[PDB]
Write a protein that binds this ligand. Structure first.
Ligand SMILES: COC1=C(OC)C(=O)C(C/C=C(\C)CC/C=C(\C)CC/C=C(\C)CC/C=C(\C)CC/C=C(\C)CC/C=C(\C)CC/C=C(/C)CC/C=C(\C)CC/C=C(\C)CCC=C(C)C)=C(C)C1=O
Ligand SMILES: COC[C@@H](CCO[C@H]1CC[C@@]2(C)C(=CC[C@H]3[C@@H]4C[C@@H]5O[C@]6(CC[C@@H](C)CO6)[C@@H](C)[C@@H]5[C@@]4(C)CC[C@@H]32)C1)CO[C@@H]1O[C@H](CO)[C@@H](O[C@H]2O[C@H](CO)[C@@H](O)[C@H](O)[C@H]2O)[C@H](O)[C@H]1O
Ligand code: HEC
Ligand code: HEC
Ligand code: HEC
Ligand code: HEC
Ligand code: HEM
Ligand code: HEM
Ligand code: HEM
Ligand SMILES: [Ca+2]
Ligand SMILES: [Ca+2]
Ligand SMILES: [Cu+2]
Lengths: 200, 468, 268, 312, 232, 16, 49
C-alpha cells in the first residue's frame, strides 16, 4: 500500500499514470465510434444540404439556437408523437458540428421540415410573439435585412467535402450563384425546412 | 527568496472582476428568458449569442482564473519554491485575459463552434492551448524544482486537471478552418456528439471538480487549521475520480442516436463515479472534525463547508440523472440547468469565494479582509440565491418533463409545449431573483476586495511573499 | 514631399501654402514667385521641391539630428521624475539612478521598435490610407490646375497650425500667427520658470495648462482637417487662444503655482 | 460492430473495473481500522493527514456500485456487442430489427405496441363515424382540441383564431369549403392559395384603384381620409381581372380558396388600404401544411371534427 | 445618401464582367492608363490571348497601358468636363460612391445631355448605361415605409411594406435590357473591377501583411524576453 | 466560361 | 542585480539577433526585388520585317 509513495516522489511517474488513466476512458468510447457502420452510414435517400441549406445551418449556428432548441427526438412515445419519428445516427453523418442540443427552451426542431409553411417560419423568426403570444423566443428582425454575399460558400463546401460530406464540383461551382441575392432569413428558413426530411 | 505572488494576486483580482461580469451576464440572459424584450432586438445581445458567452466566461474566465490563482499559490506554498518561471507565469495571466477578451469580442459577434464548452473558434482555441501548455510548464516545473520530498494531494489534483484539460482541448477542437474564427469539426453526428460530451463532462469534473478539489484540499485544512481526515481516502478518491470522470461522459447522450452500449457504459460509469466524489466530500467535511464551532466565527469556513455540502448534493444528483429511467424525465428540462447551478453556484462558486477570501489577505500583506461582516452578508446572499435557483429550476424541470411526457388516457398529449413554457415562467422569475441575490453577493465581494486591495502599502505586499 | 505625387491635394495645398508667402506686405508676391520658380505651381516647382526634399533637407535633417543627439549626450537625458540623477553617484562615479544605455535601453528600444513595426506594418499592409489621412483620397486624382477640390485641407500633421491660420480673419495676421505657433516652442525653455522639471511635481496650474494645450492642439488639428463650420470656427479660435496662452502665460503660472518637492532618487 | 471492436470495449471496460477494484482493495490494505490522531509524518505548509482508514460505509458503497455496474452491463447492452440478458425482451422476435436485447428502439417498439393496444380502438371508433357525429362527443372533441393545441395552435392561434396571415377557424367565414368533407380534405392534403401579384400587371395606379374599390365598395370601410383613388376604375379592373376567382360580388369561390371579399373579418392578410395594396401588388400565396403524413388520418379526422364543432 | 455595396475582390468572375463592362461601355471616354492589360489579365485570371481578343479594342499590346483615343482636352471641350482617368476612381471616390453614382442617373431635360445624377448633381457625364438600366426618372414609386428607423418588412413574405413616394428614381418599364437586380449586379461587377484597378495589390498586401505580423509577433516575444530578462 | 463572360457588347452582322 | 543567468542571456541575445536578421532579410526583400525588371521593362519586342 506504501508503493504509492513512489508516484509522490516522482513528477514524471505521476504524470504518466495520470495520462494513462485519463486516456483509458477516452480511447474506449470515441475510438470505436469510428469504423462503426451505424454511426457512419447515411440513411438511404439523404443528400448533403444544398449551398443555401448549408448557409442557413451556418446562420442557425451563428444565432446560437442550439442552446434553446434540440434536434434529437428520443425514442419515447410522447416524444415521437409530439415531434415525429425518432432521430437516428444515420441522419447526422454529415453534420459538422452536430446540433442535437441538450436543452429545450423551445420545441425540438428535428422534424420541423415540412411541418410548417415558409410563411410561418417567416413572421415567426421575425417576431415570434406575433404568431405565439407566449413565446419566449427572441425576435430576429435582422435576418430579413442582411443578405448573403456568398463569400465563403465555395470554401465552406470544399472544406465540408474534405471532411467526408459527398459534395461535387457542380455544387461547389454553383454555391455562389445559389445564394447570390437571397436574404439571411431565406437561408435560415430553407435550412429549417430541410431538417428531418430524410425520415418520415 | 520569496514567492511569485504577483501572478497569484493578478489572477485573484481578475477572478473577482470576471466572476462579476459573467454572473451579471447570466442574470441578463435569465431576465431575457423571463422577458424577451430584454433582447432589444439587437443581433449581438440576443439570448442565443449571449448564453454561450455566459457559460464560457463563468467556466473559463471566473473558474479558470480562480484555479490559476489557487494553483500558482498552493503549488508554491506546498512546495516551498517560487514558480518555475516568472516569464511564463505572467504570460499565463496575460494570455488568459486575452482568451477572455476573445470570448467577449467574438461570441456576441456569432463566431461560435456550437460545442457547449468549446465555443471558442479557430485561432482562439489555438491560443488557449498555447497559454495552457505554458500553464502546464509553469506548474509541473515548479513540482519538478521542489524543495520538499513529497507532492501534496492538491498538487496531484491540479496536475491531473491541467493535463486532462489539454488533452480534451486539443481533441475536441480538432477541426478544419474556413477563416479566422470560423471552423468545422472533424467529427460528425454520433461520433461528434460522443467527442463533444466526452469533452464537456470533463469541462466539469476536471476543470470544475478536480482542480477545485485541489483548492479544497488546500484551503479547507488551512482555513480550519486541522489535518486532512484521511490520506488513504485521498489516494482512492483521486485515482478513482480521474479514472472514472472520463468514462462517465456518455450519460449526456442517454437516449439519443448514440449506440446504446455507449449509453449503458456511461450510466454505469457515472453510478460508479458517485463513490469517489462522495469520498472527496467526506474527506473535506470530516477534515473539520473538532473545529465545527469555528463556523460561527469565520464566514470563510462557512463558505468552504457549504461548498462541500453542495458538492455532495450535486454529485448525488448527477449519478441519479445518469440513470436512463431518470434521464428520460430530465434530459432537456430545466432540471439539467438546476443540477448545473447546484454544482456551480453551490460548489464551484462557493469554494471559489471561500478560497479567495482567504488568499487575498495573504498575497496583499493585509492580515484581514476589509469587512468580515461583508463576508457574512455575502455568504447569506449566496446561500439564499443558490437555494432559490436550485429549487426554482428543480420545480421548472420536473414540470416540463411531466408535461412533455404527460399523456391523456386517450393517448393524445395532455399539454402543448407553449403550456410548458408558461408553466415554467414562474420558475424563470424565481431563478432571476436567485441570480440577482448571488450577483449582489458578488458585488459585495468586489467592494470588499477593492477596499482591501487599497490601503495595502508596497512593503506589506512584499514581506508576505518572503519564502519559508 | 506631399507635392511630389502631383495629385489634386498635392498641387492645391502647395498652391495655398506658397500663396501664404504672398501675404508678406511688400516682397510677398515676388518671394512667392521666386519660391515657385514660375507664375503658378508647375513642374518647375515640382522638380525644385523634389530636389530639396530628396537631398538638401535630408542632409539638413541628418546634420540636425547629429547635433541634437550630441547636445543631449553633452548634457544628459532628463527623466520622468525630473530628478538630476548626476547629483548622486557611487564610488565608481556612476549615478545611483543611472544604468548604461547599452545594453538595457538598447534592448528596451528594440522592444519598442518591434511594437512600432507591428503597428507600422499593420497600417502598411491593411490600412495604408488610414481612412484617407495617411493617403488622402483626393490626392489619388491627378493635379488639375483649373479645378480645385471642393474642400482642400492639409495633411493631418499640419492641420493644427492650419486651423490657427484659419482662425485669424486677417491674412497676414493669420500667417504671422501660424508662424508664431511654431516659433514660440523655440522660446519655450525660457518661458518655463518652474523650479521643477517634471509635470509630476509641478503645481495644479501647470498640469491644467498642459492638459489644455494638448486638448487645444488636438482640437485644432481635428477642425483644421474639415471644411469651415460655425462650431468648428468658434472652437478653432478658442483653441488658438488657449494654444498661445499655454506659452504666453507659462512664465506666470509656472511661478504662481506651488510645486511638490522633487525626490532625491527616481521613483519606480 | 466488428468482433475486434466488441472485444476492445469488453476488455477495456473490464480492465477499468478490475483496476478500480484492485485500487480500492490495495489502498485499504494495512489500514489501522480505527480513526487515529497520529498524523502523517510529513507536513505541507502546516497541512497534515490524519492517516485514517477508509470509512466502512464509503468502501461498501464503492463495492456496491461496482457490483451494480457488473450486474447491469451484464443485463443490458454493453461490453461491445453483448446484448443484455433482460428477460423482458431477451427472447421472441416481435421487434423490427431482429435483435434480442435492449435498445431505445426496442423498448420504444414495445411501448408503441402497448399504446396501440390501449388507444387504437378509440381512434378507430371516432375515425369511423361521420365528422358531424364525432363533433358532438365531448371525449372526441376534447381529443381533437388537445391535438389542435399540441399540433397546430402555434399557427392557428391557441383559441382557434389565427393571427395575421392565418385563418380564423371559429368564425362562420370559410376561405375553402366549410363543409365537413372539405374541412377534412383541407386538414389532410393541405392547401395552396396562389393569389397572383398585380403590381407588374395592372400597374401601381390600377392596384391603388382596385384596393380602394375592394376596401369601400366590397368591404364597406371608408378610405383613409386624404387618399386618392379612382373607385370606378377599380371596379372596372375588378370586373375583368378579379371577377374570375372571386365571385361577381367578390364573395369568393371555395373551389379555388378565394375568400369572401365583402367581409373584413375573413381577411387574414389585413383590411386596411395599405395592407390591401400590399396583397394585391405582391400577391399572397398562402400555404396550408398537409396534415396527412404528420399525424395520420384518424387524428386528422378528429381535428376536423373539433374545428367543425368550434365553427358550427 | 450613398448605397452600400459588398465588393468581393476575390471574385474573378465578377471582376471579369466588370472589366468587360469597362472595356465596352467605359473606355470610349475614360482611360485606365495607370493600369496595363497584362496585369489586369493576370490578376483577373484571363488568358492573355483571351484578354487580347475580348478586352483590348485599341490595338494596344498586352503589356500596354489601358489608354484610349479620346484626349482629355478634346473630351473637356466636347462634354464641358474632362472624363477623369478611372484607374484610381475607386480610391478617389470609394466604391459606395461609384455604386450610387452609376445607378443615380435620371432624365433631366434642363441638362446638356438630358440627364442628371443624384450623387453627382449637374455631372457632365452622359448616361451611357441607359440601354442597360433603361429610362430612369424622378417620379413616384413604392418605397419601404420607415418611421424613425422603424423599418417595416412583411413578416410572412419577408418583402418590404411600401408606400408611394413622389421624388424617387424609377426605371420606366420595358426600357432597358436589364431589370433592377440585373443592372445592380452589372454595376456591382463594374465597381468591383474599378476597386481592383485602384488597389491591385490588396489581396497580396493582406497575405504579406499577415505573414509580416506573425513574424513581428514572434520577434516581439523574443525581444520582450531579452528585455525583461537583462532588466533584472 | 471566361470567354463568354468577356464577350464584346457590339455585335456586327457580316456578309456571308 | 543578483546572479545574472548567463546562457539564458546568451540564448536570448542569439535568438533575438537571428530573428532580427531574418526580419532584416525580409525587409530587404522589397528593396532587392524592386531592382528586377519591372512591368515597364518586360514589354518585350515583336519581330521586325
Ligand atoms: C489649404 O492650404 C493650406 C495647407 O495646405 C494644404 C497647409 O498645410 C497650411 C499649413 C501649412 C504648414 C504648417 C506647412 C508648413 C510647411 C513649410 C514650413 C514649407 C516651407 C517650405 C518652402 C516654401 C521652401 C522655402 C525655401 C526658402 C525660402 C529658402 C531658400 C534657400 C535657398 C534658395 C538657398 C540659397 C542658396 C545659396 C546661398 C547657395 C550657397 C552659396 C555659397 C556661398 C556656397 C559656397 C561657395 C563657395 C565656397 C565659393 C566662394 C568661396 C569663398 C567664400 C572664398 C573663401 C573660400 C572658402 C571656402 C573659405 C495652410 C496654412 C494652408 O492654408
Ligand atoms: C474673431 O475672433 C477672434 C478670436 C481670436 C483670434 C483667433 C482672432 C484674430 C487674431 C488671433 C490672434 C493674432 C495673434 O497672433 C499671436 C501670434 C502672433 C503674434 C505676433 C501675436 O499673437 C497671438 C498670441 C494672437 C492670436 C493668434 C490669438 C487669437 C486671435 C479671431
Ligand atoms: C435560431 C435563431 C432559431 C431558430 C431558427 C428557431 N429558434 Fe426557437 N423556440 C423557442 C421557444 C420558447 C419556442 C416556443 C414556440 C414558438 O415560439 O413558436 C420556439 C419555437 C421555435 C420553432 C417552432 C417549433 C415548433 O414545433 O412549432 C421554430 C421553427 C424555431 N423556434 C426556430 C426558443 C428559442 C430560443 C431560446 C431563447 C432561441 C435562442 C431560439 N429559439 C432560436 C431559434
Ligand atoms: C391542426 C393540424 C390544423 C387544422 C385542424 C387546420 N389547420 Fe390551418 N391554415 C393555415 C393557413 C395559412 C390557411 C390558409 C389556407 C389558404 O390560404 O388557402 C389555413 C387554412 C385552414 C383551413 C381552411 C380555412 C378556411 O376558411 O377554409 C382549415 C379547416 C384548417 N386550416 C385546419 C395555417 C396553418 C398552419 C401553419 C403552419 C398550421 C400548422 C395549421 N394551419 C394547422 C391546422
Ligand atoms: C462606365 C459606363 C463608366 C463609368 C463607371 C464612369 N464613366 Fe464617365 N464621365 C464622362 C465625363 C465627360 C465625366 C466628367 C463629368 C464632370 O466632371 O462633371 C465623367 C465622370 C465620371 C465619374 C466622376 C469621377 C469623379 O472623380 O468625379 C465617374 C466615377 C465616371 N465618370 C465613371 C463621360 C463618360 C463617357 C463618354 C460618353 C463614357 C462612355 C463614360 N463616362 C463611362 C463611364
Ligand atoms: C385566382 C387566380 C384569383 C384572382 C385572379 C384574384 N384573386 Fe384574390 N385571392 C385568391 C385566392 C386563392 C386568395 C387566398 C389567399 C390566401 O393566402 O389565402 C385571395 C386573396 C385575396 C385578398 C386578401 C386575402 C385575405 O386578406 O385573407 C384580396 C384583398 C384579394 N384576394 C383581392 C383580389 C383582387 C383585388 C384581385 C384583382 C386585382 C384578385 N383578388 C384576383 C384568388 C384570386
Ligand atoms: C459525479 C458527479 C456528476 C455526475 C455523474 C453528473 C451527471 C450529469 C448528468 C446526468 C447531466 C445531464 C445532461 C443532459 O441530460 O444533457 C449533467 C449535466 C451537466 N452537469 Fe453534471 N453531474 C455531476 C456533477 C456536476 C458538477 C460538480 C458540475 C459543476 C461543477 C456539473 C455541471 C453540469 C454541466 C455543465 C452539465 C452539462 C449541461 C448540458 O448538458 O447542457 N455536474 N451532469
Ligand atoms: C447569478 C448567477 C448565475 C446565473 C443567474 C446563471 C444563469 C444561467 C442561465 C439563465 C443559463 C441558461 C438556462 C437555460 O439555457 O435554460 C445558464 C447556463 C449555464 N451556467 Fe449559469 N448562471 C449563474 C452562475 C453560473 C456559474 C458561477 C457557473 C460556473 C462557474 C455557471 C455555469 C453554467 C453552465 C455550465 C451553463 C450551461 C447549462 C447547460 O447548457 O445545460 N453559471 N446559467
Ligand atoms: C525628428 C527626429 C528626431 C530624432 C531622430 C530625435 C532623437 C532623439 C533621441 C534618440 C533622444 C534620446 C532618447 C529620447 O529621449 O527619446 C532624443 C531626446 C530628446 N529630444 Fe529628440 N529627436 C528628434 C526630434 C526632436 C524634436 C522635434 C524635439 C522637440 C522639439 C526633440 C527634443 C528632444 C529632447 C528635449 C530630448 C531630451 C529630453 C530628455 O532627455 O528627456 N527631438 N531625441
Ligand atoms: Ca449543446
Ligand atoms: Ca446545454
Ligand atoms: Cu456529466
Amino acid at each position: 500500500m506504501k508503493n504509492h509513495e513512489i508516484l509522490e516522489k516522482n513528477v514524471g511517474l505521476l504524470a504518466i499514470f495520470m495520462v494513462i488513466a485519463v486516456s483509458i476512458g477516452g480511447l474506449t468510447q470515441i475510438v470505436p465510434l469510428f469504423f462503426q457502420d451505424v454511426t457512419n452510414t447515411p440513411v438511404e435517400g439523404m443528400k448533403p444540404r444544398t449551398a443555401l441549406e448549408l448557409e442557413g445551418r451556418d446562420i442557425y449556428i451563428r444565432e446560437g439556437c442550439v442552446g434553446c432548441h434540440s434536434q434529437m427526438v428520443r425514442p419515447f412515445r410522447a416524444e415521437t408523437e409530439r415531434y415525429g419519428h425518432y432521430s437516428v445516427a444515420g441522419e447526422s453523418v454529415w453534420d459538422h458540428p452536430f446540433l442535437w442540443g441538450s436543452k429545450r427552451t423551445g420545441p425540438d426542431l428535428a422534424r420541423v421540415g415540412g411541418r410548417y409553411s415558409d410563411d410561418w417560419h417567416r413572421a415567426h423568426l421575425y417576431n415570434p410573439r406575433n404568431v405565439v403570444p407566449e413565446s419566449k423566443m427572441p425576435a430576429y428582425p435582422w435576418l430579413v435585412e442582411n443578405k448573403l454575399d456568398g463569400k465563403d460558400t465555395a470554401t465552406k463546401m470544399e472544406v465540408l467535402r474534405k471532411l467526408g460530406v459527398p459534395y461535387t464540383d457542380e455544387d461547389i461551382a454553383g454555391a455562389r450563384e445559389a445564394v447570390k441575392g437571397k436574404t439571411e432569413m431565406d437561408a435560415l428558413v430553407a435550412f429549417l425546412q430541410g431538417l428531418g426530411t430524410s425520415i418520415k | 527568496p520569496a514567492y511569485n505572488y504577483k501572478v497569484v494576486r493578478q489572477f485573484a483580482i481578475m477572478t473577482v472582476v470576471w466572476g462579476v461580469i459573467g454572473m451579471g451576464l447570466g442574470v441578463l440572459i435569465a431576465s431575457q428568458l423571463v422577458w424577451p424584450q430584454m433582447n432589444f432586438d439587437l443581433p449581438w445581445t440576443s439570448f442565443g449569442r449571449l448564453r454561450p458567452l455566459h457559460t464560457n466566461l463563468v467556466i473559463f474566465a471566473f473558474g479558470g482564473c480562480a484555479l490559476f490563482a489557487t494553483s500558482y499559490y498552493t503549488v508554491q506554498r506546498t512546495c516551498q519554491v517560487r514558480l518555475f518561471s516568472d516569464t511564463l507565469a505572467a504570460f499565463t495571466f496575460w494570455g488568459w485575459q486575452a482568451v477572455a477578451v476573445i470570448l467577449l469580442v467574438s461570441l456576441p459577434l456569432g463566431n461560435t463552434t456550437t460545442k457547449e464548452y468549446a465555443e471558442i473558434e479557430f485561432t482562439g482555441a489555438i491560443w488557449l492551448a498555447i497559454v495552457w501548455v505554458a500553464y502546464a510548464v509553469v506548474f509541473f516545473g515548479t513540482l519538478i524544482k521542489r524543495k520538499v520530498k513529497h507532492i501534496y494531494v492538491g498538487n496531484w489534483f491540479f496536475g491531473s486537471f491541467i493535463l486532462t484539460t489539454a488533452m480534451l482541448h486539443i481533441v475536441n477542437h480538432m477541426s478544419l478552418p474556413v477563416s479566422w474564427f470560423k471552423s468545422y469539426s472533424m467529427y460528425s453526428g454520433a461520433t461528434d456528439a460522443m467527442v463533444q460530451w466526452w469533452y464537456g463532462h470533463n469541462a466539469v469534473g476536471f476543470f470544475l471538480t478536480t482542480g477545485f478539489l485541489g483548492m479544497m484540499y488546500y484551503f479547507v485544512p488551512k482555513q480550519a487549521g486541522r489535518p486532512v481526515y484521511s490520506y488513504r481516502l485521498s489516494i482512492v478518491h483521486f485515482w478513482a475520480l480521474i479514472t472514472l470522470y472520463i468514462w462517465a461522459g456518455p450519460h449526456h447522450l442517454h437516449y439519443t442516436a448514440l449506440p446504446d452500449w455507449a449509453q449503458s457504459l456511461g450510466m454505469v460509469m457515472s453510478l460508479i463515479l458517485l463513490a469517489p466524489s462522495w469520498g472527496g466530500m467526506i474527506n473535506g467535511m470530516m477534515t473539520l472534525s473538532g473545529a465545527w464551532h469555528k463556523l460561527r466565527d469565520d464566514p470563510i469556513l462557512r463558505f468552504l463547508v457549504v461548498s462541500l455540502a453542495f458538492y455532495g448534493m450535486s454529485t448525488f444528483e448527477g449519478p441519479m440523472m445518469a440513470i436512463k429511467t431518470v434521464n428520460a424525465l430530465s434530459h432537456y428540462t430545466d432540471w439539467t440547468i438546476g443540477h448545473v447551478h447546484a454544482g456551480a453556484l453551490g460548489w464551484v462558486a462557493m469554494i471559489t469565494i471561500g478560497s479567495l477570501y482567504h488568499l487575498i489577505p495573504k498575497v496583499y500583506g493585509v492580515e484581514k479582509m476589509h469587512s468580515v461582516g461583508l463576508i457574512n452578508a455575502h455568504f447569506w446572499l449566496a446561500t439564499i440565491g443558490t437555494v432559490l435557483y436550485i429549487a426554482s429550476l428543480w420545480v421548472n424541470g420536473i414540470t416540463q418533463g411531466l408535461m412533455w411526457r404527460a399523456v391523456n388516457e386517450d393517448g393524445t398529449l395532455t399539454y402543448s409545449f407553449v403550456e410548458s413554457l408558461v408553466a415554467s415562467h414562474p420558475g424563470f422569475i424565481v431563478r432571476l431573483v436567485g441570480g440577482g441575490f448571488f450577483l449582489t453577493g458578488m458585488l459585495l465581494m468586489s467592494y470588499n476586495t477593492w477596499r482591501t486591495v487599497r490601503q495595502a502599502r508596497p512593503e506589506g505586499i512584499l514581506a508576505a511573499a518572503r519564502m519559508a | 514631399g506631399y507635392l511630389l505625387p502631383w495629385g489634386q491635394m498635392s498641387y492645391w495645398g502647395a498652391q495655398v501654402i506658397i500663396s501664404l508667402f504672398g501675404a508678406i506686405p511688400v516682397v510677398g508676391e515676388d518671394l512667392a514667385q521666386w519660391i515657385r520658380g514660375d507664375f503658378l505651381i508647375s513642374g518647375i516647382t515640382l522638380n525644385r521641391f523634389f530636389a530639396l526634399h530628396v537631398i538638401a533637407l535630408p542632409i539638413v535633417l541628418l546634420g540636425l539630428v547629429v547635433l541634437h543627439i550630441l547636445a543631449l549626450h553633452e548634457v544628459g537625458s532628463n527623466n520622468p521624475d525630473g530628478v538630476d540623477i548626476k547629483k548622486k553617484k557611487d564610488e565608481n562615479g556612476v549615478p545611483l539612478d543611472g544604468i548604461a544605455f547599452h545594453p538595457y535601453y538598447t534592448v528596451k528600444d528594440i522592444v519598442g521598435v518591434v511594437v512600432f513595426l507591428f503597428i507600422f506594418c499593420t497600417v502598411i499592409f491593411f490600412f495604408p490610407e488610414m481612412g484617407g489621412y495617411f493617403l488622402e483620397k483626393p490626392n489619388f486624382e491627378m493635379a488639375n490646375q483649373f479645378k480645385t477640390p471642393e474642400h482642400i485641407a492639409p495633411v493631418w500633421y499640419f492641420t493644427p497650425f492650419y486651423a490657427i491660420l484659419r482662425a485669424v480673419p486677417d491674412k497676414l495676421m493669420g500667417v504671422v500667427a501660424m508662424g508664431a505657433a511654431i516659433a514660440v516652442l523655440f522660446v519655450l525653455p525660457w518661458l518655463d520658470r518652474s523650479p521643477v522639471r517634471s509635470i509630476r511635481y509641478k503645481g495644479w496650474l501647470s498640469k491644467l495648462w498642459l492638459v489644455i494645450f494638448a486638448v487645444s492642439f488636438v482640437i485644432l488639428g481635428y477642425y483644421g482637417a474639415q471644411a469651415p463650420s460655425p462650431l468648428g470656427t468658434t472652437l478653432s479660435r478658442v483653441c488658438t487662444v488657449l494654444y498661445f496662452a499655454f506659452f504666453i502665460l507659462m512664465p506666470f503660472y509656472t511661478r504662481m503655482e506651488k510645486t511638490k518637492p522633487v525626490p532625491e532618487r527616481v521613483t519606480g | 460492430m466488428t468482433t475486434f471492436w466488441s472485444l476492445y470495449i469488453t476488455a477495456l471496460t473490464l480492465g477499468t473495473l478490475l483496476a478500480l477494484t484492485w485500487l480500492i482493495f490495495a489502498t485499504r490494505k494495512g489500514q489501522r481500522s480505527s480513526t487515529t490522531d497520529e498524523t502523517v509524518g510529513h507536513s505541507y505548509d502546516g497541512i497534515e493527514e490524519y492517516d485514517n482508514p477508509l470509512p466502512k460505509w464509503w468502501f461498501m458503497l464503492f463495492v456496491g456500485t461496482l457490483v451494480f455496474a457488473v450486474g447491469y452491463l451484464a443485463l443490458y447492452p454493453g461490453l461491445g456487442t453483448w446484448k443484455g440478458l433482460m428477460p423482458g425482451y431477451q427472447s421472441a422476435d416481435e421487434f423490427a430489427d431482429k435483435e434480442k436485447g435492449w435498445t431505445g428502439v426496442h423498448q420504444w417498439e414495445k411501448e408503441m405496441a402497448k399504446a396501440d393496444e390501449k388507444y387504437g380502438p378509440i381512434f378507430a371508433k371516432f375515425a369511423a363515424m361521420p365528422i358531424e357525429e364525432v363533433a358532438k362527443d365531448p371525449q372526441a372533441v376534447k381529443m381533437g382540441g388537445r391535438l389542435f393545441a399540441s399540433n397546430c395552435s402555434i399557427c392557428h392561434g391557441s383559441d382557434a383564431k389565427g393571427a395575421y396571415g392565418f385563418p380564423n377557424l371559429t368564425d362562420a367565414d370559410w376561405r375553402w369549403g366549410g363543409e365537413p368533407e372539405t374541412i377534412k380534405t383541407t386538414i389532410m392534403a393541405g392547401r395552396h392559395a396562389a393569389m397572383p401579384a398585380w403590381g407588374e400587371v395592372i400597374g401601381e395606379e390600377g392596384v391603388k384603384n382596385v384596393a380602394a374599390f375592394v376596401l369601400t365598395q366590397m368591404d364597406g370601410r371608408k378610405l383613409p381620409e386624404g387618399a386618392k383613388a379612382d373607385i370606378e376604375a377599380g371596379k372596372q379592373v375588378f370586373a375583368t381581372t378579379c371577377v374570375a376567382c372571386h365571385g361577381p360580388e367578390g364573395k369568393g369561390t371555395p373551389a379555388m380558396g378565394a375568400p369572401d371579399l365583402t367581409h373584413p373579418g375573413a381577411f387574414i392578410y389585413g383590411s386596411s388600404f395599405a395592407q390591401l395594396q400590399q396583397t394585391i401588388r405582391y400577391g399572397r400565396q398562402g400555404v396550408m401544411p398537409a396534415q396527412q403524413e404528420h399525424l395520420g388520418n384518424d387524428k386528422v379526422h378528429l381535428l376536423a371534427a373539433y374545428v367543425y364543432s368550434l365553427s358550427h | 445618401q450613398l448605397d452600400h455595396v459588398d465588393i468581393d475582390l476575390t471574385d474573378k468572375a465578377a471582376m471579369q464582367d466588370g472589366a468587360r463592362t469597362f472595356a465596352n461601355y467605359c473606355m470610349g471616354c475614360h482611360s485606365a492608363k495607370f493600369q496595363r492589360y497584362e496585369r489586369v489579365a493576370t490578376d483577373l485570371g484571363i488568358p492573355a490571348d483571351l484578354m487580347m481578343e475580348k478586352l483590348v479594342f485599341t490595338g494596344a499590346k498586352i503589356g500596354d497601358h489601358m489608354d484610349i483615343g479620346m484626349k482629355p482636352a478634346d473630351a473637356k471641350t466636347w462634354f464641358g468636363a474632362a472624363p477623369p482617368d478611372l484607374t484610381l476612381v475607386a480610391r478617389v471616390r470609394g466604391t459606395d460612391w461609384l455604386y450610387s453614382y452609376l445607378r443615380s442617373f435620371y432624365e433631366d431635360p434642363k441638362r446638356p445631355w438630358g440627364v442628371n445624377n443624384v450623387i453627382f448633381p449637374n455631372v457632365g457625364m452622359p448616361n451611357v448605361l441607359a440601354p442597360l438600366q433603361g429610362r430612369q426618372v424622378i417620379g413616384c414609386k413604392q418605397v419601404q415605409v420607415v418611421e424613425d428607423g422603424k423599418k417595416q418588412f412583411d413578416p410572412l413574405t419577408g418583402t418590404p411594406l411600401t408606400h408611394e413616394a413622389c421624388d424617387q428614381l424609377t426605371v420606366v418599364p420595358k426600357t432597358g435590357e436589364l431589370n433592377e437586380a440585373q443592372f445592380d449586379e452589372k454595376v456591382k461587377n463594374l465597381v468591383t473591377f474599378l476597386a481592383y484597378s485602384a488597389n491591385p495589390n490588396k489581396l497580396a498586401s493582406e497575405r504579406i501583411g499577415t505573414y509580416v505580423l506573425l513574424y513581428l509577433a514572434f520577434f516581439f516575444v523574443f525581444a520582450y524576453l531579452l528585455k525583461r530578462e537583462y532588466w533584472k | 466560361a471566361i470567354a463568354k463572360r468577356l464577350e464584346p457588347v457590339g455585335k456586327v452582322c457580316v456578309q456571308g | 542585480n543578483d546572479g545574472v543567468n548567463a546562457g539564458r542571456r546568451r540564448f536570448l541575445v542569439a535568438a533575438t539577433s537571428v530573428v532580427g536578421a531574418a526580419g532584416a532579410v525580409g525587409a530587404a526583400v522589397p528593396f532587392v526585388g524592386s531592382w528586377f525588371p519591372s512591368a515597364k521593362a518586360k514589354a518585350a519586342g515583336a519581330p521586325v520585317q
